[PDB]
Design a binder for this molecule. Structure first.
Ligand code: HAS
Ligand code: HEM
Ligand SMILES: CCCCCCCC/C=C\CCCCCCCC(=O)OC[C@H](O)CO
Ligand SMILES: CCCCCCCC/C=C\CCCCCCCC(=O)OC[C@H](O)CO
Ligand SMILES: CCCCCCCC/C=C\CCCCCCCC(=O)OC[C@H](O)CO
Ligand SMILES: CCCCCCCC/C=C\CCCCCCCC(=O)OC[C@H](O)CO
Ligand SMILES: CCCCCCCC/C=C\CCCCCCCC(=O)OC[C@H](O)CO
Ligand SMILES: CCCCCCCC/C=C\CCCCCCCC(=O)OC[C@H](O)CO
Ligand SMILES: CCCCCCCC/C=C\CCCCCCCC(=O)OC[C@H](O)CO
Ligand SMILES: CCCCCCCC/C=C\CCCCCCCC(=O)OC[C@H](O)CO
Ligand SMILES: CCCCCCCC/C=C\CCCCCCCC(=O)OC[C@H](O)CO
Ligand SMILES: CCCCCCCC/C=C\CCCCCCCC(=O)OC[C@H](O)CO
Ligand SMILES: CCCCCCCC/C=C\CCCCCCCC(=O)OC[C@H](O)CO
Ligand SMILES: CCCCCCCC/C=C\CCCCCCCC(=O)OC[C@H](O)CO
Ligand SMILES: CCCCCCCC/C=C\CCCCCCCC(=O)OC[C@H](O)CO
Ligand SMILES: CCCCCCCC/C=C\CCCCCCCC(=O)OC[C@H](O)CO
Ligand SMILES: CCCCCCCC/C=C\CCCCCCCC(=O)OC[C@H](O)CO
Ligand SMILES: CCCCCCCC/C=C\CCCCCCCC(=O)OC[C@H](O)CO
Ligand SMILES: CCCCCCCC/C=C\CCCCCCCC(=O)OC[C@H](O)CO
Ligand SMILES: CCCCCCCC/C=C\CCCCCCCC(=O)OC[C@H](O)CO
Ligand code: CUA
Ligand SMILES: [O-][O-]
Ligand SMILES: [Cu+2]
Lengths: 31, 166, 554
């Protein structure tokens, strides 16, 4: 199995989630 | 070897693509939620409201800044704001805390931004058009308005003030 | 040279590349000054001593945006996405047209550059009315961009000539990429051509008194989104079809590569309201529709992330790398043509993450028109696209010129690529963080040094980045000229095949490749999608026009 490619998409997913949920929290804080 | 690697790569790629689609779908649902709440008030009105930028300072609701704040409901105020090179009128904009504020903003010259620091109010102001957004200030105090659309050499010092009274 | 006689397309390709890199050098000169500004340090006095024609921060920013993001990117795209398909097919482009395209771009550039340099069009690379630039800016820019319509003709011609000689064969991979790319661009480009012909040109010539700013921005952003995919896809063509060979492996899937490009053809254009979330007079339902479709345009890059990572992993294992990290270590980190796109791909992770935030309608109110936006796009175009182009020079330049890269020039290239990457990452941190603290973009903030005290920390990152990138830029200029002005010529280097990768083939779906090769049909679907996404709004806007007078505020 492509464990290396999976590691990359894990880093990508975590980054997307941190960015998105982070800004979502800011949006509500400023609402 | 190459056949086996290829098979495994495609199998796990399909799993990734389904996951990524799921994630994007969850974001869409979370956005839809925002649209059903009071926080969506900052989305500009879609309806076209045309005005003439060459007469806005002489006739109509932007002509006298001291009359810009109008009570339009039991707990609602409409505020006629002019964004212009390089400032905002009235200055300050004075509103009660806990009231729904309907900002109606236009420009007599070029495009300006209207970004109220500490809030989600962030709206482009186009000459000839009225930008209408809504917000309720929960905390009293002074809020800065920043022009965040390049409008010429005066852009970086173009600021205004909203005072939210207790 | 007998080489240029047999392959005249090498010389025209070289002219596009060199003109592009010159534009990049000139536009980039302003970069370190801008990064210092975003670090609250004013170095404009120094800049004006060196370049006395520079009248303001904003004239510099206009030059930076136009030269780097419009000129360099277009010229790179025209070089790569004509020359690569031509070499894959082993066919000659219509050379009359190729040279016409170059001269249109060169003349267009000269014509708009004059007013820019004379401080007559300090309106930024978006040129939003009613800010009113000199007619030569709009005319020169229109001619520059229309150069690409010739390129579209050239590649469609190559493809049709090849299909005539090879009835019932599927389009080869690189040529499939280029065909769908150029067809996407044609549809994409209509917004700006309409904006220029109907509004900006008659206005700047004094034929009409005003322009409606809302209709102008709407037409602008019809093109303004897909133009970024126009910038990206030449880099993607290299990353899919050349990089795996440079890495020591193979492309792990031809079909998945074609599928990514097909999705770009369908989804790049009908999404531009994501630049207009903060605009009045556009219905919120239509904003939500574009938001959803923008989240969909992210899918081809999410796909690319896996297809490419798996190809690099395969290369690393072929070269002896074992475990979970060994495959990375085993890759050819001594080759700048490998290193540059790979570093660009790493920075594209946070770049992509920020793009998905931007696309999310209400979340855009947090970040719109703040420093966050430049933080996002420097990761995408100033890092990935630019690095892929810089790396290309270590394989593409010798192929076009016969000029060898010395071991010393190779090492200098590694240094440039790493410093450029690192400087972009540091600046991205400073800009995203400043953006979250409400610092506006497009602002000479160093001239209001007490206005943003909360941003003191990220401002330090911006100063550091300005310094790092200045060094990277100076080393790049030195490196590029050392190659372009070197004496030696080895014609066998110009006659060598391009380093195109082999593909791992499997039982697959030959039917999927056949389905994707229905290009005429997919082009029609793409066009319909644009009609459905833009039509209803544009009908309303055109029936309620409110033109307003122009202004010069510089
Ligand atoms: C080439 C340049 C650009 C690309 C690409 C790009 C992509 C996106 N953007 Fe953007 N952007 C927006 C949304 C997106 C979205 C959803 C994406 C998506 O297409 C991104 C998807 C990408 C990913 C999901 C990343 C995939 C990761 C990969 C492929 C890397 C994998 C790593 C590997 C394989 C390495 C492994 C190797 C090892 C050794 C380990 C929005 C709105 O939704 C705005 C307006 C905001 C506002 O308020 O003004 C915006 C504004 C900008 C502007 C400013 C325009 C202006 O001047 O006003 C520019 C120039 C720009 C450029 C670019 N943008 N963007
Ligand atoms: C030496 C490298 C570079 C540095 C230090 C640099 C720095 C900057 C900074 C700090 C800004 C924000 C300025 C502002 O909002 O007022 C900016 C704007 C910009 N940069 Fe760069 N940059 C560089 C390279 C590039 C390149 C290679 C691209 C394109 C390929 C690019 C495209 C742009 C664009 C499009 C803008 C926005 C212009 C506008 O808002 O009108 N940059 N850059
Ligand atoms: C390396 C180069 C890449 C550049 C990397 C860019 C950095 C931005 C990263 C994450 C954004 C996450 C948003 C951060 C906001 C979190 C704050 C929070 O948790 O919000 C609650 C608070 O109450 C609100 O007021
Ligand atoms: C993942 C589930 C989505 C919940 C979002 C969690 C979050 O960040 O909270 C939102 C906001 O801060 C609440 O006040
Ligand atoms: C805050 C916590 C955040 C953490 C969020 C979790 C991140 C999930 C990441 C990637 C999923 C990738 C998809 C996995 C692949 C699916 C399995 C598959 O397809 O494998 C079957 C294969 O055929 C067998 O041989
Ligand atoms: C097979 C597994 C399927 C399960 C997968 C389900 C996805 C769960 C994620 C998000 C749900 C959305 C939650 C919506 C609630 C939003 C509330 C919120 O964020 O509140 C904001 C603020 O505090 C007040 O306005
Ligand atoms: C690596 C990147 C790390 C970045 C770190 C994240 C920075 C985000 C911080 C704050 C955003 C939340 C804003 C909350 C708004 C409150 C402001 C406020 O209350 O001010 C208005 C008024 O003036 C008072 O009376
Ligand atoms: C400005 C107008 C002058 C334009 C003069 C353009 C001169 C074109 C010369 C050129 O490169 O023509 C291709 C040549 O025929 C292939 O060998
Ligand atoms: C002065 C403008 C610079 C002119 C650059 C020279 C262009 C000459 C050219 O086009 O090359 C010759 C011809 O195309 C070979 O086939
Ligand atoms: C490249 C093309 C550049 C545009 C130049 C000429 C196109 C023809 C323009 C025709 C002029 C129409 C203006 C007109 O009739 O104006 C109406 C008036 O504003 C209401 O009373
Ligand atoms: C093609 C070469 C030249 C086009 C000539 C165009 C020259 C038209 C001059 C228009 C002008 O100067 O503008 C009029 C007025 O000042 C309102 O902007
Ligand atoms: C595949 C294509 C999918 C396209 C389908 C997308 C779904 C859009 C439907 C309704 C959005 C309603 C949004 C209305 C927001 C108004 C908020 C408001 O009342 O503003 C204050
Ligand atoms: C504030 C932000 C600034 C920090 C930004 C840093 C971002 C991450 C840097 C590099 C990742 C590259 C990972 C891969 C490293 C390759 C080196 C390697 O494995 O080399 C093997 C050896 O040289 C035999 O060739
Ligand atoms: C606080 C943290 C410090 C801030 C960072 C300072 C910035 C740059 C330092 C110079 C770094 C130059 C990196 C050169 C790496 C290189 O050329 O690596 C080739 C390698 O063998 C594989 O490709
Ligand atoms: C291998 C490729 C590289 C990809 C990886 C790089 C992406 C960076 C992502 C997240 C860092 C952001 C750090 C999160 C900072 C949280 C903000 C915080 O703590 O803020 C507190 C706030 O003040 C409370 O009100
Ligand atoms: C990897 C690159 C790391 C870069 C910088 C280290 C961060 C140092 C930032 C320290 C902030 C110091 C500062 O500027 O002080 C803020 C404030 O004004 C004082 O009272
Ligand atoms: C090989 C050597 C690697 C070098 C990597 C250095 C490590 C990164 C840390 C700091 C960068 C310092 C640059 C910042 C310059 C001064 C910042 C400034 O303007 O000071 C702000 C202060 O808050 C005013 O009150
Ligand atoms: C290879 C390229 C990477 C090279 C990166 C090296 C960056 C320099 C790092 C440390 C020296 C900083 C020490 C000097 C600090 C002076 C700060 C200063 O003068 O700041 C302005 C001040 O705020 C006015 O009021
Ligand atoms: C937006 C919500 C409503 C709209 C819903 C959109 C979501 C559906 C998307 C894709 C379906 C995937 C179907 C792909 C199946 C094709 C099978 C294939 O190609 O795989 C065969 C393999 O090669 C041999 O085993
Ligand atoms: C405008 C015409 C160009 C756009 C249509 C491209 C699709 C097409 O022509 O498909 C059939 C092909 O020519 C057979 O090889
Ligand atoms: Cu008003 Cu910038
Ligand atoms: O434009 O993203
Ligand atoms: Cu876009």
């Amino acid at each position: 199995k492509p464990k290396g490619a999976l590691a990359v998409i894990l880093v990508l997913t975590l980054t997307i989630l941190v960015f998105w949920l982070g800004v979502y929290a800011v949006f509500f804080a400023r609402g | 070897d190459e056949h086996k690697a290829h098979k495994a790569i495609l199998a796990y790629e399909k799993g990734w693509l389904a996951f990524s689609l799921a994630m994007l779908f969850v974001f869409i649902a979370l956005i839809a939620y925002t649209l059903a709440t009071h926080t969506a008030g900052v989305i500009p009105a879609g309806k076209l409201e045309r005005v003439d930028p060459t007469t806005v300072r002489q006739e109509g609701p932007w002509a006298d800044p001291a009359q810009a704040v109008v009570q339009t409901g039991p707990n609602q105020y409409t505020v006629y704001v002019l964004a212009f090179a390089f400032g905002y009128q009235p200055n300050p904009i004075e509103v009660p805390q806990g009231a729904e504020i309907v900002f109606k903003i236009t420009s007599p010259d070029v495009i300006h931004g209207f970004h109220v620091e500490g809030t989600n109010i962030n709206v482009e102001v186009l000459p000839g058009e009225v930008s209408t957004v809504r917000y309720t200030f929960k905390r009293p105090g002074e809020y800065r308005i920043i022009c965040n659309q390049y409008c010429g050499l005066g852009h970086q010092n173009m600021f205004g003030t909203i005072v939210v009274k207790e | 040279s007998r080489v240029y006689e047999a392959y005249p397309e090498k010389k025209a390709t070289l002219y596009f590349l060199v003109l592009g890199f010159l534009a990049l050098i000139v536009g980039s000169l302003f970069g370190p000054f801008q990064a210092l500004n975003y670090g609250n340090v004013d170095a404009y006095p120094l800049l004006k001593r060196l370049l006395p024609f520079v009248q303001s921060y904003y004239q510099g920013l206009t030059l930076h945006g136009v030269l780097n993001a419009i000129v360099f990117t277009q010229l790179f795209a025209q070089a790569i996405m004509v020359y690569l398909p031509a070499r894959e097919l082993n066919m000659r482009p219509n050379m009359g047209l190729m040279w016409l395209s170059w001269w249109m771009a060169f003349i267009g550039l000269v014509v708009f550059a004059l007013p820019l340099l004379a401080n007559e069009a300090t309106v930024l690379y978006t040129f939003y009315p009613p800010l009113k630039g000199h007619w030569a800016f709009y005319l020169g820019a229109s001619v520059f961009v229309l150069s690409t319509w010739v390129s579209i003709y050239i590649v469609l011609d190559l493809w049709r000539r090849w299909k005539a000689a090879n009835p019932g064969k599927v389009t080869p991979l690189v040529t499939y990429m280029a065909v769908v790319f150029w067809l996407m661009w044609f549809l994409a480009s209509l917004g700006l051509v309409l904006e220029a012909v109907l509004f900006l040109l008659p206005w700047s010539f004094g034929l009409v008194e005003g322009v409606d700013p809302l209709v102008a921005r709407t037409l602008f952003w019809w093109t303004g989104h897909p133009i970024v995919y126009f910038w990206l896809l030449p880099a993607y063509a290299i990353i899919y079809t050349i990089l795996p060979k440079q890495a020591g492996g193979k492309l792990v899937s031809d079909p998945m590569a074609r599928l990514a490009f097909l999705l770009f053809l369908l989804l790049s254009t009908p999404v531009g309201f994501h630049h207009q979330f903060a605009d009045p007079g556009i219905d919120p339902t239509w904003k939500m529709i574009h938001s959803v479709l923008t989240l969909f345009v992210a899918v081809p890059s999410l796909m690319t992330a896996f297809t490419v990572a798996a190809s690099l992993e395969f290369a690393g294992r072929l070269r002896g790398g074992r475990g979970l990290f060994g495959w990375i270590r085993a890759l050819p980190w001594d080759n700048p043509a490998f290193v540059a796109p790979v570093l660009g791909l790493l920075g594209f992770i946070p770049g992509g993450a920020g793009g998905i935030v931007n696309a999310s309608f209400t979340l855009d109110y947090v970040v719109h028109n703040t420093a966050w936006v430049p933080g996002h796009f420097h990761l995408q175009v100033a890092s990935l696209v630019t690095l892929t182009a810089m790396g290309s020079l270590y394989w593409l330049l010798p192929n076009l010129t016969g000029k060898p890269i010395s071991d010393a020039q190779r090492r200098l290239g590694l240094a440039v690529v790493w410093l450029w990457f690192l400087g972009m990452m540091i600046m991205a941190v400073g800009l995203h963080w400043a953006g979250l603290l409400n610092v506006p973009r497009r602002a000479y903030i160093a001239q209001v040094p007490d206005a943003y005290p909360h941003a003191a920390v990220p401002m330090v990152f911006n100063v550091l980045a300005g310094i790092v990138l200045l060094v990277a830029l100076l080393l790049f200029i030195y490196g590029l000229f050392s190659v372009l002005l070197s004496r030696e010529r080895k014609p066998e280097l110009a006659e060598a095949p391009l380093p195109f990768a082999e593909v791992i083939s499997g039982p697959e779906d030959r039917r999927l490749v056949l389905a994707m090769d229905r290009i005429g049909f997919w082009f029609a679907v793409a066009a319909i999608l644009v009609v459905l996404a833009y039509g209803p709004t544009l009908v309303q806007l055109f029936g309620h026009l409110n033109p307003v007078p122009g202004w010069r505020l510089w």
